[PDB]
Write an enzyme that holds these catalytic residues in place. Structure first.
Site, PDB file in Angstrom:
ATOM      1  N   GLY A   1       0.885  -1.155   0.000  1.00 20.24           N
ATOM      2  CA  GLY A   1       0.000   0.000   0.000  1.00 20.24           C
ATOM      3  C   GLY A   1       0.922   1.203   0.000  1.00 20.24           C
ATOM      4  O   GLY A   1       2.129   1.055  -0.223  1.00 20.24           O
TER       5      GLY A   1
ATOM      6  N   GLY B   1       4.433   0.618   2.197  1.00 25.35           N
ATOM      7  CA  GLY B   1       5.301  -0.409   1.636  1.00 25.35           C
ATOM      8  C   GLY B   1       5.872  -0.021   0.276  1.00 25.35           C
ATOM      9  O   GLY B   1       7.054  -0.276  -0.005  1.00 25.35           O
TER      10      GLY B   1
ATOM     11  N   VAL C   1       5.365  -3.735  11.303  1.00 23.77           N
ATOM     12  CA  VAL C   1       4.890  -2.341  11.294  1.00 23.77           C
ATOM     13  C   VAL C   1       3.432  -2.279  11.805  1.00 23.77           C
ATOM     14  O   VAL C   1       3.031  -1.274  12.405  1.00 23.77           O
ATOM     15  CB  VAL C   1       5.080  -1.577   9.950  1.00 23.77           C
ATOM     16  CG1 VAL C   1       4.945  -0.068  10.181  1.00 23.77           C
ATOM     17  CG2 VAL C   1       6.440  -1.901   9.303  1.00 23.77           C
TER      18      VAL C   1
ATOM     19  N   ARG D   1      10.913  12.094  14.758  1.00 21.08           N
ATOM     20  CA  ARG D   1       9.899  13.158  14.778  1.00 21.08           C
ATOM     21  C   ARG D   1      10.230  14.153  15.897  1.00 21.08           C
ATOM     22  O   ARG D   1      10.102  15.372  15.728  1.00 21.08           O
ATOM     23  CB  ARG D   1       8.492  12.581  14.980  1.00 21.08           C
ATOM     24  CG  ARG D   1       7.944  11.776  13.805  1.00 21.08           C
ATOM     25  CD  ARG D   1       6.422  11.637  13.878  1.00 21.08           C
ATOM     26  NE  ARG D   1       5.953  10.746  14.955  1.00 21.08           N
ATOM     27  CZ  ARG D   1       5.322  11.152  16.052  1.00 21.08           C
ATOM     28  NH1 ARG D   1       5.124  12.442  16.270  1.00 21.08           N
ATOM     29  NH2 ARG D   1       4.920  10.272  16.960  1.00 21.08           N
TER      30      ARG D   1
ATOM     31  N   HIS E   1       4.883   2.453  21.737  1.00 22.34           N
ATOM     32  CA  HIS E   1       4.543   3.268  20.575  1.00 22.34           C
ATOM     33  C   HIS E   1       3.066   3.648  20.691  1.00 22.34           C
ATOM     34  O   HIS E   1       2.223   2.788  20.945  1.00 22.34           O
ATOM     35  CB  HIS E   1       4.822   2.506  19.278  1.00 22.34           C
ATOM     36  CG  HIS E   1       4.264   3.168  18.056  1.00 22.34           C
ATOM     37  ND1 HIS E   1       4.786   4.353  17.576  1.00 22.34           N
ATOM     38  CD2 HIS E   1       3.218   2.805  17.282  1.00 22.34           C
ATOM     39  CE1 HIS E   1       4.058   4.661  16.518  1.00 22.34           C
ATOM     40  NE2 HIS E   1       3.113   3.751  16.296  1.00 22.34           N
TER      41      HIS E   1
END
Ligand SMILES: [Cl-]
Ligand SMILES: [Cl-]
Ligand SMILES: [Cl-]
Ligand SMILES: [Tb+3]
Ligand SMILES: [Tb+3]
Ligand SMILES: [Tb+3]
Ligand SMILES: [Tb+3]
Ligand SMILES: [Tb+3]
Ligand SMILES: [Tb+3]
Ligand SMILES: [Tb+3]
Ligand SMILES: [Tb+3]
Ligand SMILES: [Tb+3]
Ligand SMILES: [Tb+3]
Ligand SMILES: [Tb+3]
Ligand SMILES: [Tb+3]
Ligand SMILES: [Tb+3]
Ligand SMILES: [Tb+3]
Ligand SMILES: [Tb+3]
Ligand SMILES: [Tb+3]
Ligand SMILES: [Tb+3]
Lengths: 307, 303, 299, 305
Positions: free
Chosen positions: B13, B16, B117, B149, B173
Site C-alpha cells: 500500500g 510499503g 509495522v 519526529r 509506541h
C-alpha cells in the site's frame, strides 16, 4: 550539494513523491510545496522533514496554499491540471489545462526570474508552448516530454534482453503519448547497436515485441495504481539536478525550438541538460528526423485549436 | 553501503510502496520481493520502481507476488499488512493477520529479520516472535519514528541543524511513548544546559506539544504518515544487514525486570544481533519503561 | 548534510587521504589543512578542490603552515620502545594541544599519534572541558579483523560483526564473544558448516596482512583515512554507530584511563564495557593497568 | 549508480591506488583488477583498500596481479602514467613502445573494453593504442577532462560562485596549448562575459587562465604530481561510460577532423556506451583553433617509428 530552491506546484501523489526524492537523494537544500487543497502541502512537508531527519539531511521546507507565495525559486515543477477523462479529446484537455497553466504562469512570472519551469501537465508539448508564451524571457520553460518514455523503453530492453539497466542507451522522441517513437538508431547495449547485439546472441526478440511490452507494462501500472508515480518523480529529480548542477546529461525533454519546415514547437529530442539547454536533432538519423517533423506539425495543430 | 541480500515487503500500500521505492533509488539494496493480496498491486509497484531504478542507473532485481507463501530466502521482511477503535480490539483483529503471515514465512526464510509495522506494534511484535521463535529475528518499528519526529521538532524549535540533535523516544509506541530527556543533546551538550546558556526560553512541554501538533497535521491532511516511516525501515533493515551497529529505539522482545519477556522500545544496537541498552536510560526513565512494558503485556494478554 | 569544520593536523599520505575522503564521500562544508612543510598543505588543498569540482561538491578548504591558525574547528584529526616513544610524543601532543585549546571550543580532538591510549590521556589533560578528546585506539584493528574473517570464511564483509579491544598495538585482543556472521556467533557458524578454521589461524592471518601492507606501501593509508572519516562523521552527524576508540573513562579497579572498548559515537561518547563477557573484561582490566603504568611514568 | 562491471587499473602507484580507493569507497563499481609490475605492490594496495571497504560496508571483489596478461574480461582499463624518468619527439617515441606493448598484452582477453590513456603526449598515445586495439575495444585519452574541471574550479573561486553553477570546456591538445572554449563558459546559464559585466567584477579572461596555471604549478611544487583531481576524473569518465550516463566531458578521442584526417583531439564528447564528439558545441573561431590543435597532434603522430 546544490544551494538552490525547487518549487512544486501540486503536491498530489507525483508532487509529494518528487518532494521526497529531493529530500532523501543527494542534491537539493531548499523546497517550496504548493497545493490548493487546504492543509495538504503542510502535511506532505512535515512528513518529508521527518524522513530528512532519518537520512540526516539538513533541508528547509516551506508550504503554502497559494501559488503567488512562490518567490526566488530556481526550479519550478508543475504537476497541477486535470486528468484526461475517457470521453474527452486531446483538444478538450488542451482547452481545460491551457487556462490552468496560464493562471499558474501569470502568478509565478514576476517573482521567479531565471527559473526553469518543468511542465508535467498533459498534453505536455502543447502545455509547454502555453507556459513558454506566458513566461517568455523571464525564465526557461520545458516539459517532461518523452523523458520517462525513454527510461520505460530502456527498462523493457533490459528485461527482454537479460542485460542490467546500466548497459542500455537510446531515446524515445517526438510527441509524448501514443505517437512517441523509438529512435532505433540511438539504441545500444554496452555500446553495441541493438540490431547487432540481438543477432549475435541468437535472441528471439523483435523491435515490435519490445514496443508492445513497453505499452503492456505501462497499462499494468495504470490498471493497478491509477497512474505512474515512482518513475516520473525520479525523472523530474534527474532533469532538475542536471540543470541546477550543470551535469550536461542527455535527456529527451519537451523544449520549444526551431524545427526545419515546421517552425517553433515544443517537441522532445535528445537535449543537453545543463545551465543552458541544447537540443541535438543530429543524434537522430534522416528518417527519424522526418518523423520528428510530423510530430511537431501534430503538436502545433493541437496548440492552434486552443480556444 | 552495498549489500548482496534480499528484502521482502509484505503489503505494498502507500507505506510499503514508498519503502520499495527508497530501496530502488538509494545505495544499499539491489534485491527485493513485493507482496500484496490485492491483485496486480505488487506487480504495478514493481514495474514503476524499475522505471525509477533506470533513472538512477541502479541495476536491481525485483519479484512481485500475490501469495505471501512465495517469499523464500529473504534476509529481511518488512510487514505493513493489517487493519489501520481501542488498542485491545485492534490487537485481536490484527494478531490473526500476523500469525497467518508468520506461519507462511517461517520455514522458507531461515535467519530472516522480521520488521513488524502492523499496530499495536509492540503487541504484534510479541505475536510474531511466538510464531517465528528461533528460526529468525523478530522486531517491531516501536518508537523509531517517534524518535526522529522528536529530533525534527528540536531542530526546528531550537533553530539548530538536524545533524546536531540526539535523543530518544521510548516505551510503548502511541500516546504513552515518552521522551528520555536524559539522552537529549545538542552537539553533545545536554538540552537543558544548551537552552539555558543561550536564553532559548523553550520548555520540554512546548517541544512535546509541538511534536503532537505536527503529527496531528499529517493525519488530518493525508490520513497517515508515509515518508517518515519508509525512511525508518531503510535505516533499520540496512543497519541490521550491513552490521552497522547504529543505535535506534525499536520494539524488541526482551526480559524486563519484574514484568517478564515483552517487546518494548529502548535505544537498541541494530546489528546482526540486536542488543537493547536499558542502561542508556536514567533511574526514573527505567521506572516508566517498566510501566510501559506492563501496559503492552496487558494488551497482549487480552488476545 | 554536515555544516561543520574539520581540521587535519599533518597532511602526509594519511592526512591528505582523509582530507580527500571528507571532500568526495560524506561532504563537509569546511576543511582546514595544516602541515609545517611550506606549500605542502596548500598544494593538497588545490588538488582536492579539483576533485570536488569533478564530483560537483561545494567545499571550502583553508590551508596553513602553523597549528595556531586553526580556529573554530568542530573536529581536529592529529596525524625504540613504547615507553620511550611515550616520553617523546607526550611533549609533541602537549604543544599541539596548548596551541589549539582556546581557539577551538567544543572541538572533538582525534589522536592518532602512538602510543595512542597514552597520547589520548596526555591531550585530554591539556584540553579538559574545552573540547572532547579521543584516540583512534582499536577502530582500525576491528575493521582489519572483520576483513580477515570475511576472507577466510568466504562471507561478504557486510555480514561480519565483532570488536578488537584493549591497548592498541601488540596487546590488542579480539573480544570473540562479539564476533558474528549474519548475527550467528562465529563458533556456531563454523561448526554448523564444518569450516576447518581456528581463532588462531584468523589472528595470524590479520597480522600477516598488516605486515604485507607495510612491506609494499610503507604504511597503512586507505584503511586509516576511511576510519577517521567514519568516526568524525558519526560524532558530528549524531549517527550513534558503535566503534572501539581510545576514550578516557573509569575502569573498575583502575580509575581514569583511555582504553578501547566498543563505544557509542555520537555528540556524546558512551563506552560500552558490558558488551564484553567477564573474561574479556578481565583482560581489558589488565590492558588499562598497563596503559595507566605508562601514563604515570610521563607525569 | 550500481554497476555489475569490472574495471582494471594498470599501475598502482599514487594515482592508480587513489583511483582504486575512490571506486572502493563511493557507489558505482564493486569489481576491480589491480595490476603492478613491482612484486607485492598491487596486493598491498588491494589489502588496504579492502580495509576501507569494510569501513564503508561496501561488498567489493578485488584481484591483484603482477602481470598485465592476467587482466581478463575488463569492461574499463585505466593505464596510469609511469615514472617521468627528456626531449619531446624522443619521449613520444619511447612512450609509444610502452603503450604498444601494454596494448598487445591486453587486446585479446578484454573484448569491447574501454581503454583510458593518461601517458604523455596523451593525444598521440591515444592514437598509438587505437592502432593496436582497433575494433576489439574503444580507446580514449584523458585529454582536457581534468583541465576543464580545474578551469571550472578557478572560475568558482575567483567569481565567488558555487562550483555547481559553472559550465564550460577546455578543448584542443592537452598541455600548454589547451585552450578555453569561452563561448561555452556560463554561470547559472548566463555567459561569463555578461555575468562579469553586469556585476562589475574586476576579473578578466587572462586573469582566470593565469590563475589556473599558477594553481597547477603549486600542486607540482608541493606534491610533485596531481593525484586527487585525476583519480576523481577517471571515476567520472568510467562510470559515465559503464552506466550509459551520457555526461558531456572533453576527452581525447580518435575522430575525423576535415583538413587533418584521423586524429585524437579533446572536444566536448557524450560519455556513454558509444562516445560521440560534439565539435558543433564550439563556435566558428574555437573550431578553427581546434583544427590547428589537430594539425599539431597529427604532426607529432606522423613522426613516430
Ligand atoms: Cl498547506
Ligand atoms: Cl502469485
Ligand atoms: Cl495502536
Ligand atoms: Tb483513444
Ligand atoms: Tb488513446
Ligand atoms: Tb498514429
Ligand atoms: Tb543525406
Ligand atoms: Tb470490543
Ligand atoms: Tb504460542
Ligand atoms: Tb492512550
Ligand atoms: Tb551561565
Ligand atoms: Tb584568533
Ligand atoms: Tb615488540
Ligand atoms: Tb600478552
Ligand atoms: Tb560473574
Ligand atoms: Tb632526438
Ligand atoms: Tb613547452
Ligand atoms: Tb600559445
Ligand atoms: Tb582565423
Ligand atoms: Tb626498431
Amino acid at each position: 550539494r546544490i544551494p538552490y530552491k525547487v518549487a512544486v506546484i501540486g503536491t498530489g501523489r507525483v508532487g509529494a513523491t518528487f518532494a521526497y526524492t529531493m529530500a532523501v537523494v543527494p542534491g537539493i537544500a531548499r523546497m517550496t510545496l504548493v497545493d490548493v487543497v487546504p492543509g495538504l502541502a503542510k502535511g506532505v512537508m512535515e512528513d518529508i522533514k521527518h524522513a530528512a531527519a532519518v537520512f540526516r539531511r539538513s533541508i528547509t521546507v516551506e508550504a503554502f496554499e497559494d501559488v503567488s507565495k512562490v518567490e526566488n525559486a530556481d526550479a519550478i515543477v508543475i504537476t497541477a491540471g486535470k486528468p484526461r477523462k475517457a470521453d474527452m479529446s486531446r483538444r478538450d484537455l488542451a482547452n481545460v489545462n491551457a487556462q490552468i497553466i496560464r493562471d499558474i504562469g501569470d502568478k509565478l512570472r514576476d517573482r521567479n526570474p531565471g527559473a526553469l519551469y518543468v511542465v508535467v501537465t498533459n498534453p505536455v508539448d502543447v502545455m509547454t508552448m502555453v507556459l513558454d508564451d506566458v513566461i517568455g524571457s523571464k525564465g526557461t520553460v520545458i516539459g517532461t516530454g518523452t523523458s520517462l518514455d525513454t527510461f520505460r523503453f530502456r527498462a523493457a530492453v533490459s528485461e527482454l534482453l537479460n542485460v542490467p539497466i546500466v548497459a542500455v542507451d537510446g531515446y524515445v522522441v517526438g510527441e509524448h503519448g501514443e505517437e512517441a517513437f523509438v529512435a532505433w538508431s540511438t539504441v545500444t547495449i554496452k555500446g553495441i547497436h541493438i540490431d547487432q547485439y540481438i543477432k549475435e546472441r541468437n535472441i528471439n526478440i523483435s523491435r515490435e515485441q519490445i514496443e508492445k511490452y513497453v505499452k503492456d507494462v505501462a497499462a499494468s501500472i495504470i490498471a493497478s495504481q491509477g497512474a505512474t508515480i515512482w518513475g516520473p518523480a525520479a525523472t523530474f529529480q534527474e532533469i532538475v539536478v542536471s540543470h541546477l548542477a550543470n551535469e550536461s546529461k542527455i535527456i529527451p525533454i519537451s523544449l520549444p525550438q526551431n524545427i526545419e519546415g515546421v517552425g517553433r514547437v515544443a517537441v522532445s529530442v535528445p537535449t543537453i541538460i545543463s545551465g543552458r539547454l541544447k537540443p541535438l536533432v543530429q543524434l537522430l538519423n534522416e528518417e527519424e528526423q522526418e518523423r520528428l517533423k510530423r510530430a511537431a506539425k501534430a503538436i502545433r495543430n493541437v496548440y492552434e485549436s486552443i480556444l
